[PDB]
Amino acid sequence: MEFPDLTVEIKGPDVVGVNKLAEYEVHVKNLGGIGVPSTKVRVYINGTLYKNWTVSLGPKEEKVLTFSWTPTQEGMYRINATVDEENTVVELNENNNVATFDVSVVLE
């Protein structure tokens, strides 16, 4: 067809202080033994786009994206990452290409 299985992962600190810089990583890999050149990985915070990357992935290839974020307001933040948001490639799984990560920001 052929139909890859793209997946993404969010990892990093769970609780961060206010007005402090934290580093997070996105782990994106192919699991369909076919490479996608069009592979776009994006990250949102509370629905709003924070950052984006365009990359290419070969068969069973993994790439690591990084970003650094300083939350200036205290509160709960939900960080989501998606790959192929625009749906340019049809995959073997469609729910297996999103990652949800919960962050708590404190004034501490």
Residue 89 annotated as binding?
yes
Query: What is residue 36's DSSP assignment?
Result: B
Q: Look at the chain and report how many structural domains it folds into.
A: 1
Residue 65 annotated as binding?
no
Residue 21 annotated as binding?
no
Residue 5 annotated as binding?
yes
How far is Cα 94 from Cα 39, in angstroms, rounded to an integer? 14
End-to-end CA distance of the chain: 52
Angstrom CA distances, 60 to 10, 22, 33, 76, stand at: 18, 29, 6, 35
Residue 96 annotated as binding?
yes
Domain residues for the domain of 62 are: 1-108
Task: Give the CATH number for residue 37.
Answer: 2.60.40.10
Residue 102 annotated as binding?
no
Count, residues in the chain: 108
Residue 94 annotated as binding?
yes
How far is Cα 49 from Cα 61, in angstroms, rounded to an integer? 26
